[PDB]
Design an enzyme around this catalytic site. Structure first.
Site, PDB file in Angstrom:
ATOM      1  N   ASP A 246       7.119 -32.985  10.457  1.00  0.00           N
ATOM      2  CA  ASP A 246       6.606 -31.779  10.846  1.00  0.00           C
ATOM      3  C   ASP A 246       5.860 -31.668  11.801  1.00  0.00           C
ATOM      4  O   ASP A 246       5.999 -30.663  12.760  1.00  0.00           O
ATOM      5  CB  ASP A 246       6.132 -31.241   9.351  1.00  0.00           C
ATOM      6  CG  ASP A 246       5.580 -29.951   9.449  1.00  0.00           C
ATOM      7  OD1 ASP A 246       6.119 -28.867  10.185  1.00  0.00           O
ATOM      8  OD2 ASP A 246       4.586 -29.453   8.671  1.00  0.00           O
TER       9      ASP A 246
ATOM     10  N   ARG B  19       5.309   2.593 -12.355  1.00  0.00           N
ATOM     11  CA  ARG B  19       6.397   2.514 -11.497  1.00  0.00           C
ATOM     12  C   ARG B  19       6.001   1.562 -10.552  1.00  0.00           C
ATOM     13  O   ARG B  19       6.913   0.759 -10.042  1.00  0.00           O
ATOM     14  CB  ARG B  19       6.427   3.908 -10.659  1.00  0.00           C
ATOM     15  CG  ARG B  19       7.231   4.693 -11.361  1.00  0.00           C
ATOM     16  CD  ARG B  19       6.702   6.204 -11.544  1.00  0.00           C
ATOM     17  NE  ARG B  19       7.463   7.213 -12.638  1.00  0.00           N
ATOM     18  CZ  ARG B  19       7.036   7.519 -13.827  1.00  0.00           C
ATOM     19  NH1 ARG B  19       6.154   7.051 -14.287  1.00  0.00           N
ATOM     20  NH2 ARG B  19       7.987   8.175 -14.543  1.00  0.00           N
TER      21      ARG B  19
ATOM     22  N   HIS C 221      14.204 -24.238  11.305  1.00  0.00           N
ATOM     23  CA  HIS C 221      13.160 -25.121  11.734  1.00  0.00           C
ATOM     24  C   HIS C 221      13.093 -26.593  10.826  1.00  0.00           C
ATOM     25  O   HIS C 221      13.069 -27.498  11.131  1.00  0.00           O
ATOM     26  CB  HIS C 221      11.888 -24.392  11.856  1.00  0.00           C
ATOM     27  CG  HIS C 221      10.726 -25.427  11.736  1.00  0.00           C
ATOM     28  ND1 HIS C 221      10.029 -26.137  12.524  1.00  0.00           N
ATOM     29  CD2 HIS C 221       9.903 -25.656  10.653  1.00  0.00           C
ATOM     30  CE1 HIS C 221       9.052 -26.778  12.068  1.00  0.00           C
ATOM     31  NE2 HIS C 221       8.995 -26.588  10.843  1.00  0.00           N
TER      32      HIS C 221
ATOM     33  N   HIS D  93       9.000 -27.924   2.980  1.00  0.00           N
ATOM     34  CA  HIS D  93       7.892 -27.662   3.600  1.00  0.00           C
ATOM     35  C   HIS D  93       7.904 -25.988   3.949  1.00  0.00           C
ATOM     36  O   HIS D  93       8.832 -25.742   4.376  1.00  0.00           O
ATOM     37  CB  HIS D  93       7.286 -28.650   4.686  1.00  0.00           C
ATOM     38  CG  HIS D  93       7.485 -28.116   6.072  1.00  0.00           C
ATOM     39  ND1 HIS D  93       8.953 -27.984   6.716  1.00  0.00           N
ATOM     40  CD2 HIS D  93       6.821 -27.529   6.886  1.00  0.00           C
ATOM     41  CE1 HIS D  93       8.714 -27.204   7.698  1.00  0.00           C
ATOM     42  NE2 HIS D  93       7.497 -27.260   8.133  1.00  0.00           N
ATOM     43  N   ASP D  94       6.756 -25.292   3.903  1.00  0.00           N
ATOM     44  CA  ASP D  94       6.776 -23.985   4.420  1.00  0.00           C
ATOM     45  C   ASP D  94       7.355 -23.234   3.242  1.00  0.00           C
ATOM     46  O   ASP D  94       7.304 -21.867   3.210  1.00  0.00           O
ATOM     47  CB  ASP D  94       7.472 -23.489   5.686  1.00  0.00           C
ATOM     48  CG  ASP D  94       6.846 -24.039   6.833  1.00  0.00           C
ATOM     49  OD1 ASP D  94       5.522 -24.369   7.068  1.00  0.00           O
ATOM     50  OD2 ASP D  94       7.593 -24.422   7.810  1.00  0.00           O
TER      51      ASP D  94
HETATM   52 MN   LIG Z   1       5.917 -25.777   9.690  1.00  0.00          MN
END
Ligand SMILES: [Mn+2]
Ligand SMILES: [Mn+2]
EC number: 3.1.5.1
Lengths: 495, 488
Positions: free
Chosen positions: B258, B426, B67, B115-116
């Site tokens: 976007d 751990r 995308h 972006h993202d």
């Molecule tokens: Mn987006």
């Protein structure tokens, strides 16, 4: 004479634009092509096609897609380098490039992206399992000479008939074409006949890596061997391929001048990335790797490209892995890109001709550095059991899948054609359902190629079969590593 | 005065280049940045981060990566359009761009790509599960005014103004803000100031508590950066010539791309997942438009693409995409140029496609159809809810590390093997080395003596945990959840 106006063909095959067009108008056509490629599902499929390592539950590892993006940025740099150097040589206007600057570059990037586009699910192993499955069913070696009294071919029509026929040559070509599947050749088949993208001639030129026809049987021309190293196109594309040569001003077995740039980047990116991933999969430390590279160089000098690249990047890392690979990549490109950029310009007439029987990064210091990475990758990474396991796994998946679809091939034309018209056939219900499993695009393509043939022709049944096999091959090659495996299990009945 | 030489900052934070540099030298720095981004694992992670639809056994569906590549090509077109228009206006040399042509464009593409990048595994739902988990443990609402006699905060330490800021910052996790945190403090990329500017989408600090900026409402819609970045963010403003709460002029271009790519792609995938036919969709779009005219953008785009189609689906989406860009890109390209002074200032309180624009309307139309038919699908919603539990549960699995004293926690940081706290040991080993490293570094930069020091440690401790989780792919986070719940 070198004129890129003549090589950067902005026209298309179907619904082609024509007449004049400005620098801007032309840029827009090439920019159109980008959008076409980037939105293609065939380009999306690559995030699910394996690159060296298995598709792990963390995307830390490179896939065919992430690798091709990396290749594309390398290609961008080389192209950009060729251009800048040439503007400094002022030969840009002289070679008809002053106005095709952007296009040139975009074509490289887009061809870079589309390398590996036609590759099957399990890559080179997929190719094997396909070719092998067809070989046991066709035996193209039995066609090479005169009609053998005991022809090993499973197909009646493709078996060399004893009677004086030139049809015997058609059988020969079909057997070799179907048994010699190659990703690059499938890539050409894909963008045109399958994906029906309708790209600029120039773009399709950039993805035509080899000049060898798939049906080729003899010894390779001594002055063309490099260019005909594997196959570049199928018998199904021969027509369109001729159309491409004429449009891009290429002689029989001549390569598109930009293809060489794209090829180079792929050859560079090729290893280093998998080597980064190797240390990421913990196969060995970054330190362990450096020592394997020191071991591999042998003939050590304090001014060699090893010192300038690998030794250099090793020192940068100490006062780690990130920095190491980051600068190792840098170091490599910073020396190799200029070389190939130069090599291109230096051998530009033969490259423009597309006759140049060599690579930008030859065999005789850059080629050496690459080979070094390759050797280390071969001896340590490509040799890893998890890799090899998956490689073997892939083989069976495809072989088995091909066998699942054998019933469609093990059929008469009269019967097969019947299935193409009526979707529901009485006596062949398995075959019906199996034919429905095939993707609508490859299915469509088969029918179209068939409808273009003359019904009356004695070659017509041979063609049908050639196409039938092509259709099957398209389905399989079209699949992702995951989908092919998933389907194998589903059709073996274990889900 | 508009001069892009002053906005296209080719310098870096650390090991920064300085002194003159040619058009070519500058191009190379911006081209360097591309290579940095494209080879980043943080960029690879996106092929395993879900975009609307679940992963599926066939990559026919778009992932966060596929995308973002689409977004980037849109961004490329807009940037390229702004440039071409400006060369026709001859204002290119006049705005100090004649030599920064390529850079400008690359920055857009690279910001588009990124972006993202800072989004968590189950994006938007991940944000929720994080913020919610922290809210039940901090209750930042209880900090707003005077010290409450009954403070709901689970942390003893959480100077009263420092407590307020920490509580709001940790409880207001945002992907964009995490993106900034990521490229600098986590990924340690060392990108050109200009690039980092392009990914700074919002001007609101995460710690902000005092609804809506009136004059800067739009620019502070969501948070843009964390308290952990405030220092570096100040450094960024000064380098890019930005006032407090002022946006980088190119960010607007990336944003636009976007807003466009946003739906159409998922709508293509919707028909692909067989939710409805391409024909069914066209009718849903006809229903959605209502106020029909024979010369509107609907006719010009959707009606147009529908006629071209009569593969059908391929052709439809192919030309629908074309149709959209062919009308929207010029608009936003113009809008940019038209409102360039306020955009250059980064004060412009609006979007490129925003007002009563026929463009904004077309987008909204796609969005509505996607909301009412696609985003509403049960398999989507199922996964959305699933994601929430995965993250919430995972956060709970790591609660023991937070439910600890500084003296104890620090002890675990020095000695890798601690006697009394073996589970915690751990669990701390499970964290990635990079976020681990980053925590220590931020901590070592604080003054030991300081009374704020323990508060900071906790702020960072939480940040560290948040980084681990947000860093994960949808798959890894789910896989880990099951593994730590013991079902594999
Ligand atoms: Mn987006
Ligand atoms: Mn490759």
């Amino acid at each position: 004479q070198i004129d890129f106006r003549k090589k950067i063909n902005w026209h298309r095959r179907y619904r082609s634009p024509q007449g004049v067009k400005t620098e801007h108008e032309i840029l827009r056509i090439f920019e159109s092509d980008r959008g076409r490629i980037i939105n293609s599902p065939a380009i999306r499929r690559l995030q699910q096609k394996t690159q060296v390592f298995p598709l792990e539950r963390n995307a830390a590892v490179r896939t065919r897609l992430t690798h091709s993006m990396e290749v594309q940025q390398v290609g961008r740099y080389i192209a950009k380098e060729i251009l800048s150097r040439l503007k400094e040589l002022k030969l840009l206007e002289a070679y008809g490039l002053d106005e095709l600057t952007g296009p040139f570059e975009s074509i490289v990037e887009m061809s870079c992206l589309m390398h590996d586009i036609g590759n099957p699910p399990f890559g080179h192993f997929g190719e094997a399992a396909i070719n092998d499955w067809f070989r046991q069913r066709l035996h193209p070696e039995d066609a090479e000479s005169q009609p053998l009294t005991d022809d090993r071919c499973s197909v009646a029509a493709l078996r060399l008939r004893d009677g004086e026929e030139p049809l015997n040559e058609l059988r020969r070509k079909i057997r070799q074409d179907l048994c010699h599947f190659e990703g690059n050749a499938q890539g050409i088949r894909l963008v045109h006949t399958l994906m029906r993208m309708n790209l600029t001639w120039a773009q399709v030129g950039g993805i035509l890596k080899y000049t060898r026809p798939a049906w080729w049987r003899g010894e390779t021309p001594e002055t063309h061997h490099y260019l005909m190293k594997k196959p570049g196109y199928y018998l199904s594309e021969e027509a369109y391929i001729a159309r491409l040569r004429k449009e891009l001003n290429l002689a029989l077995y001549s390569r598109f001048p930009l293809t060489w740039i794209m090829e180079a980047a792929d050859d560079i990116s090729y290893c280093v990335a998998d080597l980064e991933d190797a240390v990421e999969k913990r196969i060995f430390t970054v330190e362990q790797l450096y020592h394997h590279l020191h071991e591999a160089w042998g003939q050590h000098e304090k001014g060699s490209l090893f010192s300038l690249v690998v030794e250099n990047a090793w020192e940068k890392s100490r006062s780690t892995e990130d920095q190491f690979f980051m600068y190792l990549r840098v170091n490599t490109l910073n020396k190799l890109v200029p070389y190939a950029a130069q090599r291109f310009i230096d051998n530009l007439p033969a490259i423009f001709a597309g006759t140049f029987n060599h690579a930008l990064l030859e065999d005789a210091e850059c080629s050496d550095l690459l080979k070094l990475y390759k050797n280390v990758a071969v001896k340590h990474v490509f040799s890893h059991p998890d890799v090899e396991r998956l490689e073997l796994q892939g083989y069976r998946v495809i072989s088995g899948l091909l066998e699942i679809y054998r019933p469609l091939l093990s059929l008469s034309l009269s019967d097969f054609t019947e299935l193409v018209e009526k979707e529901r056939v009485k006596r062949f219900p398995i075959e019906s359902r199996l034919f429905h499993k095939l993707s609508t695009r490859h299915r469509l393509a088969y029918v179209e190629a068939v409808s273009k043939l003359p019904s009356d022709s004695p070659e017509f049944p041979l063609w049908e079969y050639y196409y039938r096999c092509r259709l099957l091959q398209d389905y399989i090659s079209g699949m992702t590593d995951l989908y092919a495996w998933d389907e194998y299990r589903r059709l073996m009945a274990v889900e």
